[PDB]
């Protein structure tokens, strides 16, 4: 048990250290105990490997993709350094050293002596970064739990799922409630009315047993520490209450949630990022709900914007190559752009040539508003050059051309036509370089960097203990 014991502190030390880097990354001793009990319901060797697996299965969920892979590389070294050869130890470390900028060398080869390790260096040597990073995850041979799975297994009425501002799992929770047990209630926390209606629907849903959601709490936070902090703590009658689950959405980058409330509630990180085409299809999808105030022509411009927005967002993640810093673009940015588009058509003739100041105003006020660096300001503009001015044929991406509205002029049919142009296309493997006009060589540079960041923070963690 000492051999079980020594490993488990070094594991807890590692999970504890994530809570130092980030506030949401918390772990109690009870959470580790409850996890180790699940491990039961060469004997010692298997029980040990059962621990490493069950810890990776439960605590992988409450971290983001970067820290998933940091914990993977680490936990793998925490096991295999004690278990395997010393020949093994410097070989895998000499590999983690190459991924990081610490050193670049060739590890120890013995024919058939090590095969899993022979396979890993092949990933690192093929300059393929993301694959090498995931190698450590897969070597755990765990089924990596989906938010649903986590929720189902979980035996608590509360959850707080943080996420980057790029996405929101609010819509994932809709399909999660639909697929099992229904009962979905989305509650924005906005202005006294929202909080006031909110606290009413809180006390009543738990007696009723419906699922409830508290959208983007972080903004209405002052209230949380006073009402929600006490309310959720007092509700150990929520144990008594009908099968009901409360959900809270956070933002990782943002105001720090009360730690007591946070540690009491289960934690997840939506990390789930849509492709360009799917975001285009998702932008265009709602747009039919609006009704009709404009011409058939406009729907073409709204389609154009759907593509545009989905292309800047795609680029937002890849920095430095891409944008200089992280910028966040919203449904607000699309809204303010759409409204200027309706306005330019409401003030101008249906002659296509109004195009010139459509770009300036989109690229410098609507979207270039938050942009401060001259470098990035050009990027928004150069995108507008491409997305907006088109005659007859646009070719947004290399696969897809959008032709300008036809003489038939049906507003029904053009929606259906422009939806059809989405359904014809199949998003290539190399989207990030083919569709976003930046080079492939840049994308690899980025892949390298996030590798280096996982590789570093792991080495650092091991030396610290």
């Amino acid at each position: 048990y000492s051999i079980i014991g020594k490993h488990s502190v070094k594991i807890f030390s590692m999970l504890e250290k994530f809570g130092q880097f980030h506030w949401f990354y918390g772990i109690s001793i009870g959470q580790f105990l409850s996890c180790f009990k699940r491990v039961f319901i060469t004997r010692v060797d298997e029980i040990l490997w059962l621990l490493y697996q069950e810890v990776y299965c439960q605590f992988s969920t409450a971290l983001d993709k970067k820290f998933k892979m940091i914990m993977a590389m680490t936990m793998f070294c925490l096991y295999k350094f004690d278990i395997e050869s010393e020949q093994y130890k410097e070989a895998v470390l000499t590999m983690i050293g190459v991924l990081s900028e610490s050193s670049d060398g060739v590890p120890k080869l013995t024919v058939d002596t090590n095969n899993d390790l022979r396979y890993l260096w092949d990933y690192v040597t093929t300059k393929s970064y993301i694959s090498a990073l995931n190698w450590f995850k897969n070597e755990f041979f765990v089924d990596e739990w989906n938010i649903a799975d986590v929720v189902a297994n979980s035996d608590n009425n509360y959850f707080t799922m943080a996420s980057e501002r790029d996405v929101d799992g609010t819509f994932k929770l809709i399909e999660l409630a639909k697929a099992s047990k229904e009962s979905l209630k989305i509650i924005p926390l906005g202005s006294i009315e929202n909080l006031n209606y909110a606290q009413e629907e809180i006390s009543k849903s738990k007696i009723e047993g419906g699922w409830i959601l508290l959208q983007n709490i972080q903004m209405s936070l002052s209230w949380v520490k006073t009402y929600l902090h006490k309310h959720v703590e007092e509700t150990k009658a929520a144990e008594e209450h009908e099968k009901f689950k409360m959900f809270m959405t956070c933002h990782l980058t943002g105001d720090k949630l009360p730690a007591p409330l946070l540690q009491r509630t289960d934690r997840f990180v939506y990390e789930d990022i849509p492709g360009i085409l799917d975001t285009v299809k998702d932008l265009w999808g709602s747009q039919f709900f609006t009704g009709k105030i404009s011409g058939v022509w406009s729907v073409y411009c709204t389609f154009l914007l759907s593509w545009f927005h989905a292309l800047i967002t795609a680029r937002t993640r890849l920095v430095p190559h891409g944008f200089s810093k992280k910028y966040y673009f919203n449904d607000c940015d699309f809204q303010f752009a759409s409204v200027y588009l309706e306005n330019v058509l409401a003030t101008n003739s249906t002659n296509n040539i109004p195009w010139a100041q459509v770009r300036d105003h989109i690229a410098t006020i609507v979207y270039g508003g938050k942009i401060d660096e001259e470098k990035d300001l050009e990027v928004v503009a150069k995108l507008c050059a491409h997305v907006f001015c088109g005659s007859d044929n646009l070719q947004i991406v290399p696969g897809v051309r959008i032709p300008q509205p036809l003489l038939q002029q049906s507003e029904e049919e053009e929606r259906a036509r422009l939806t059809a142009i989405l359904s014809n296309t199949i998003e290539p493997a190399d989207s990030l370089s083919s569709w976003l006009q930046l080079p492939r060589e840049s994308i690899l540079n980025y892949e390298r960097l996030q590798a280096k960041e996982v590789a570093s923070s792991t080495e650092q963690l091991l030396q610290e203990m």
Binding site: I4, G5, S8, I29, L33, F40, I47
Partner: protein
């Protein structure tokens, strides 16, 4: 503060009936049914060397080390 100081070192002036301790200025009577305990919440906090040497330091701390001790109890209940 320093004033408790004489109460921490067990220092007194014995008298006709009374046991007096100097606090800051006034010499005050000690009962003897009187007890003293000092409580601290943060182990980051550093206490003065005068206190730390005359004080019986006891750590009621829920450590990482506490996991090693507690895992064996749970392991043995499911092993033997």
């Amino acid at each position: 503060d320093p004033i408790i100081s004489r109460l921490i070192s067990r220092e007194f002036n014995h008298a006709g009936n009374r046991v007096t301790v100097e606090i800051g200025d006034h010499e005050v009577d000690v009962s003897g049914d009187f007890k003293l305990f000092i409580h601290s919440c943060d182990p980051s906090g550093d206490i003065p060397i005068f206190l730390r040497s005359r004080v019986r330091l006891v750590h009621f701390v829920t450590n990482k080390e506490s996991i090693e001790t507690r895992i064996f109890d749970i392991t043995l209940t499911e092993e033997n």
